Amino acid sequence: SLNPDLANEDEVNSCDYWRHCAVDGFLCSCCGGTTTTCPPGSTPSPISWIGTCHNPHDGKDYLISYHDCCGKTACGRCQCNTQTRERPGYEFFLHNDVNWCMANENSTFHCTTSVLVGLA
Amino acid sequence: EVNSCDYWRHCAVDGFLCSCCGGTTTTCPPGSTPSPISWIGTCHNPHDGKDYLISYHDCCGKTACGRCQCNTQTRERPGYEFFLHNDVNWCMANENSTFHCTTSVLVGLA
Amino acid sequence: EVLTGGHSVSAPQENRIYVMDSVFMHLTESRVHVYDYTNGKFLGMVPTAFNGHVQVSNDGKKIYTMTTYHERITRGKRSDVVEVWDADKLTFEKEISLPPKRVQGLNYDGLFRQTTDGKFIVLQNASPATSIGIVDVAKGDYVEDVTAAAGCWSVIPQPNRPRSFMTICGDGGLLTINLGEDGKVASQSRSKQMFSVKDDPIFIAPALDKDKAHFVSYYGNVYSADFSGDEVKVDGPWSLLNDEDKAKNWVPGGYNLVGLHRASGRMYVFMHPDGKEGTHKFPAAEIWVMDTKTKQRVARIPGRDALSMTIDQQRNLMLTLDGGNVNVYDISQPEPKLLRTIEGAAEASLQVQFHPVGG
Amino acid sequence: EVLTGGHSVSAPQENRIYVMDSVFMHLTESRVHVYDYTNGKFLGMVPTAFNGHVQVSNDGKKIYTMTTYHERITRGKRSDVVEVWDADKLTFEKEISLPPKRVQGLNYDGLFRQTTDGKFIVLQNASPATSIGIVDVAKGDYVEDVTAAAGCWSVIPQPNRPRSFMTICGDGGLLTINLGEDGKVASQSRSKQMFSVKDDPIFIAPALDKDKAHFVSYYGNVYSADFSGDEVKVDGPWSLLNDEDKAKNWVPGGYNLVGLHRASGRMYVFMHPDGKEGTHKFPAAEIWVMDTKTKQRVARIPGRDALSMTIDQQRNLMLTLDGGNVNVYDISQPEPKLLRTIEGAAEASLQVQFHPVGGT
């Protein structure tokens, strides 16, 4: 449940995969990357919005950091728009209607990652 | 229809009909620039039974219109007969070559 | 025949609407599509590069866009800009340089606005630190950076003052900024807490009256800000919901999800049943029509999966938008009447706007 | 966990194909999609701005793109460029400036090619005056226009010579260009008329062998150019069509519509029935497989509405492409065998290419 690289690809590439609970973007794992690695030639964002997602497999809740990969045009695959615990821009780092590539050397948005931080 | 790819004057259009894009068969949509150059089609008029020369000038300098895409090829020839050829952007010589839409300008009898 | 350029839009300004197509699948080729709402005819477009935002000048003469370029799109130097375009010729006139931190995000109205007097453009920055930027239209210059708005979000102009606007802050209150005639901050004020950020977060989209604004919350409550005076007075909640509605878990959802018909005080809100955490951006099952004076619903109609709306006061119209299609409604009476649907107005739009006619 | 970049493509080069997505509906955001043909996995992409063209270096190390930028996209100064990208990292390395007249058009292979020795990129210019442009890969420079090619179109490299290529001219013949080591024209020659431009125009896509090329015509004839010697010898037509074929008006149609399996001499061609003026770019009703030695058809199979193809000599494969989906065929026997289809590989692509394996 905590190691998507050991999981079924079809499972992790789904918007309903538990850790993708606040993704507004294209899943990087469908874009030539993995849940925690940018597709070749795209650059991680140093900033992100954060979700809290429930893991139904182990019953615990986890902080997930939605870093983007940046500097390539839209991946176009596995678009998700999930909104669990997402909040508007006055709670800015909980907010997913902004481009978290906004502070990168190149801000063009490529895809979104779902990085496990730890227990909520 | 004039907005249909089947309209007789559009017999060699590879692009978006400008008449669906805020212009007409002979006028560019606002803020798009005519191409000085074009490919030419010879199209059959189903009314009078005569063939006419149609000049497919593009409108340029705006991004793709996206409406009424046509890909008709009557009497169209490859790039070695360059001005009969429609797989190239006839905006290529414009100040801004971004392709917006294609017009179907009646020149006269073929 | 001879092909000519130089032509103006073929329908009168009063017939025009502006569908901001993010083209999210190809976000570097976002654009504004101009339509005639009376017959669905496509009138023209304005290219807006990466994640463009758009508004029409209050006087109806110009279109303002906000966008980001790079020298080589995906590499090279960044240029954030406002562009001024002629509204009738749909031609580029002027580029106004911005600092490289204009908001990149979905097209909420409040990210790119102007003062009531039309003399200043007021836009949201995120670097990710937030501030509000001020552009002097006459001078073609970025003139002010309102760092006082740090930790706040979006711009709600006050229609009863020439150069004043509000923003929603992390304390659950509103910061009001009054600009001088030079576009620099002339004064400011902070309201008391209007809503609990943690327990009842509001949607940012205002239902904007001349001297007050209403906001709806994730749980179907309504908050109000009265700016008839210099200090904004806040109140709420009242609930959009009766007991029956609560039984079926009705809540608001959408983006630009509310609107106000100023003559009647009717507020329009996209609503869906079976609300729970994570449903705040769900398409509308219904549009609810609320009497803001009696604080009670007067009508409900099918929502047509809409996500965003906008209101024309003078022609008593509401447009709704499901991401691709624009629905035109007559709202001259309490029950909206569907006049037509414009199919394929955009690939990925969350914002439609009427050409101003009010001057 | 920590998000990282700097990674290489996950599948080895021999698994890779390049789908050039024009994205015609948003032609300013064209791109190359990189796929694994063995399992249909999306591997990465290269952005190519307005109407990108793409090829892989013969040595398989780099991806070359050709594109047009403007300072403000729809206004401002034009920059036509070739870009060099690392194939494994899919990262940008170098921009080579071109004169502002690179061909803007659909993705026929012959608009953006390289010499056999890989030392020169050879591309079509149109201002609309035509010329061939030469880029010196080692220097990262534009050399000069091949003005002798005025009135001609497209680039057919000679795989038997290090820096020679041909182009098709309005006189219905071929112009051959032989470059010197500096990328300038060292010599040239012009064939006799190969085809009647008026009466039997050919598709520009070559079915390219090591020392000859075949071309199909709008009416289903085949023409041949043998460049085994210094002077090109031309012949044809012969017909692709038997009486039954002719009775049903079968003709070729497509874009990159032919292919040659060099070891067998089998030529692959998209065909459709009920041909008449205007059907030359119709999707394939069938793919015909022709023995170019015996001049007879040896197989016919469903076309899957394909428009473009490419052949891999080293793995005996044919890819076909219908604009959005890529079909993978085993062509080690006369009858092709369909292995799989990659759905949704592009929105508007007329060109797919394998990552080169071997080829020396």
At position D82, the amino acid (one-letter code) is V
Nearest CA in chain A to C276: A84
Spatial CB neighbours of D311, under 8 Å, sequence gap ≥ 6: D259, D260, D261, D268, D317, D318, D331
Tell me if D123 is assigned to a ligand binding site. Answer: no
Active-site residue flag, A49: yes
Spatial CB neighbours of C329, under 8 Å, sequence gap ≥ 6: C317, C318, C319, C320, C336, C337, C338, C339
> How crowded is residue D196: how many other Cβ atoms within 10 Å of its Cβ?
12
User: Which chains share 3+ C-beta pairs under 8 angstroms with A?
Assistant: C, D
Question: Do chains A and C meet with 3 or more Cβ pairs nearer than 8 Å?
Answer: yes
Residue boundaries of the structural domains of chain A: 1-120
Query: How far is it, in rounded angstroms, from Cα C210 to Cα C160?
Result: 6
Nearest CA in chain D to A39: D44
Q: How far is D163 from chain C (nearest CA, A)?
A: 31
Is C338 at the interface with chain A, CB within 8 A? no
Is D40 at the interface with chain A, CB within 8 A? no
Residue C21, helix vs strand vs coil: strand
Domains of chain D: 12-355 (2.130.10.10)
CA dihedral A81, A84, A85, A91 (to 10 degrees): 0
Query: Does residue D297 contact residue B91 with C-beta atoms inside 8 Å?
Result: no
Cis, peptide link before residue D128, omega less than 30° from 0? yes
Query: Does residue D113 contact residue D54 with C-beta atoms inside 8 Å?
Result: no
Q: Quickly name the fold that domain B1-110 has.
A: Electron Transport Ethylamine Dehydrogenase (2.60.30)
CA dihedral B30, B32, B33, B37 (to 10 degrees): -120
Question: Do chains A and D meet with 3 or more Cβ pairs nearer than 8 Å?
Answer: yes
Tell me if A96 is assigned to a ligand binding site. Answer: yes
Annotated binding residues of C, as ranges? 24, 27, 51
D304 alpha carbon, distance to own chain's centre: 20
Is C359 at the interface with chain B, CB within 8 A? no
H/E stretch holding D245 reads helix D243-247
Looking at domain A1-120, its CATH superfamily turns out to be Methylamine/Aralkylamine dehydrogenase light chain (2.60.30.10)
Length of chain B: 110
Q: How far is C1 from chain A (nearest CA, A)?
A: 41
Residues A49, A58, A61, A100: which is the catalytic one? A49
Nearest CA in chain B to C46: B62
Query: Does residue C308 contact residue C321 with C-beta atoms inside 8 Å?
Result: yes
| CA C281 to each of CA A23, A81, D103: distance values in angstroms, whole numbers, following the listed order | 13, 9, 45
Helix, strand, coil in percent for chain D, rounding step 5: 5, 50, 45
Query: How far is it, in rounded angstroms, from Cα B5 to Cα B45?
Result: 14
Nearest CA in chain A to D11: A32
| CA D33 to each of CA A36, D40, D65, D255: distance values in angstroms, whole numbers, following the listed order | 21, 12, 12, 19
| CA D183 to each of CA D126, D137, D179, D360: distance values in angstroms, whole numbers, following the listed order | 19, 10, 5, 21
User: Which chains share 3+ C-beta pairs under 8 angstroms with D?
Assistant: A, B, C
Query: How far is it, in rounded angstroms, from Cα A23 to Cα A13?
Result: 12
CA atoms within 13 A on the CB side of C123: 36
Tell me if D27 is assigned to a ligand binding site. Answer: yes
Is C91 at the interface with chain B, CB within 8 A? yes
Query: Does residue C60 contact residue C357 with C-beta atoms inside 8 Å?
Result: yes
User: What method did the depositors use to determine the structure?
Assistant: X-ray
Residue D296 burial by CB count (10 A; 0-12/13-18/19+): exposed, middle or buried?
exposed
| CA D39 to each of CA A6, D159, D321: distance values in angstroms, whole numbers, following the listed order | 19, 31, 16
Nearest to D234 by CA among D176, D311, D149: D176
C24 alpha carbon, distance to own chain's centre: 18
**Two structure tokens written together for C230:** 């210099």
Query: How far is it, in rounded angstroms, from Cα D72 to Cα D340?
Result: 42
User: Quick one: three-class SS letters along A1-46?
Assistant: CCCHHHCCHHHHCCCCCHHHCCCEEEEHHHCCCECCECCCCCEEEE
Cis, peptide link before residue D252, omega less than 30° from 0? no
Q: In what order do the strands lie in the sheet with C152-157?
A: C152-157, C164-169, C174-179, C185-190
Question: Do chains A and B meet with 3 or more Cβ pairs nearer than 8 Å?
Answer: no
Nearest to D73 by CA among C92, A10, A69: C92
Q: How far is A37 from chain C (nearest CA, A)?
A: 19
Query: How far is it, in rounded angstroms, from Cα A40 to Cα A28?
Result: 11
Residue C148, helix vs strand vs coil: helix
Residues A18, A58, A68, A100: which is the catalytic one? A68
Query: How far is it, in rounded angstroms, from Cα C272 to Cα C255?
Result: 13
Residue D15, helix vs strand vs coil: helix
Annotated binding residues of C for substrate, as ranges? 24, 27, 51
Resolution of the experimental structure, in angstroms: 1.5
Looking at beta carbons, which residues of chain C come within 8 Å of D69? 71-73
Is C308 at the interface with chain A, CB within 8 A? no
A41 alpha carbon, distance to own chain's centre: 18
D275 alpha carbon, distance to own chain's centre: 24
DSSP string over B13-62: -EEEBGGGTTSBTTBPPTT-EEEEEEEEEEEE-TTT--EEEEEEEEEESS
